[PDB]
């Protein structure tokens, strides 16, 4: 696996170098979010009202993407439907405040639909 | 004839990166990556090519143990 | 970090073009295209990457019925 | 094969578009020669004195690449060893002249070695 892994590390380094050369707003968004631990759980859909599930690691990333019931991601707007914690317990949108932030079981999971 | 050729070349690499991560073991998911790879190559305008590229790239980003993006930036910042 | 990334992306496409031409049926030739594909990705300077790219591209050009280069230039000159 | 061929024509068009964007002297040489019918018969070797076999369609392409016993191809010099015609009959280097050109059985085959 030693000879095989060196080719994998070389092809993956080339992959993101090409993506970095594209400089696409929607591509840079999902890559930068993935760097902060904000990764999707399924294939990002393109049809309207389709399910998307993203992970939000900390509260500082939540306010950067969520505004009210709208969720901005991949250069698109998403209508939030469910919010759960690490124990699969549904969390209301009113609980997520700056005062109640360190009381929830981070990270959370947002199930939203495309606009 | 434009940047369109750079996105289509990258989509072939991304599908090759997935197949080296042994994604072909899932006939359900591999057929979705193949069909998106075919959609990008047959796209006309850049808008359809990039949006399909987002769906294909999200497949890679959805696998936690596959790639740590912070690791590749370290190997990149050490050489520059 | 340079044009080096454009040659390595193209070599992945060229290997993918060969595999779609069903070159994998020859274990002797496919192992040579795979090893050249691995040599380009692991190359350090651009001189070694392009010279290995010449050997890999010559595999495609050596197959007469595979690709007529004049045909692709017609589909390219008609659209431009 | 109709759906599969459209992807093949799309990937091959992208392949040469990338090669055209590279603008490499050795890459442009073998592609332009292949357009004129001057195609290699085996993998272009990189080691010295290794065998290379190229096809030369007409006499106007011969003088563009061959000078004496030296053969220029892929941005490299090659020492010619054998020259045969369409009937596998070995042709000497002295026969290939402008006066005896339409008498040979074109195309020819050159077996040369790297310098």
Numbering used by the authors:
A (entry chain B), D (entry chain B): 77 to 191
B (entry chain A), C (entry chain A): 0 to 79
List sentences quoted exactly from the publication behind this structure.
SARS-CoV-2 RdRp, also referred to as nonstructural protein 12 (Nsp12), is the catalytic center of the macromolecular complex frequently referred to as the replication transcription complex (RTC). The RTC is essential for virus replication because it makes copies of genomic and subgenomic RNAs and polymerizes antisense RNA. In SARS-CoV-2, besides RdRp (Nsp12), the RTC involves nonstructural proteins Nsp7, Nsp8, and others. Nsp12 is the largest component of the complex, and Nsp7 and Nsp8 are considered cofactors.
To provide insights into the structures, key residues of association, and multimeric state between the SARS-CoV-2 RTC’s cofactors, we solved high-resolution crystal structures of Nsp7 bound to Nsp8. Crystals of Nsp7/8A were shown to have a truncated N-terminus (at residue Glu78) for Nsp8. In all of our crystal forms, the heterodimer formed between Nsp7 and 8 places Nsp7 near the half β-barrel-like domain of Nsp8 with the N-terminal helix of Nsp8 extended and pointing away (approximate dimensions of 40 × 40 × 46 Å). The similarity between all heterodimers in all our crystal forms is remarkable, with a root mean square deviation of 0.82 Å for 184 aligned Cα atoms despite different unit cell dimensions, different space groups, and different asymmetric units. In contrast to previously reported Nsp7/8 structures from other coronaviruses, in all three of our structures, either as in the asymmetric content or symmetry related, a heterotetramer or a dimer of heterodimers is present as an elongated, thick rod shape of 40 × 92 Å. The differing crystal forms show only slight variation in the packing of Nsp7/8 heterodimers to form heterotetramers. In Nsp7/8A, the tetramers are formed by the crystallographic twofold rotational symmetry. The heterotetramer interface involves a total of six helices: α1 and α2 of Nsp7 and their symmetry mates (twofold rotation) α1′ and α2′ and α1 of Nsp8 and the symmetry mate α1′. The tetramer interface is not as extensive as that of the dimer having 1813 Å2 with 73% being hydrophobic.
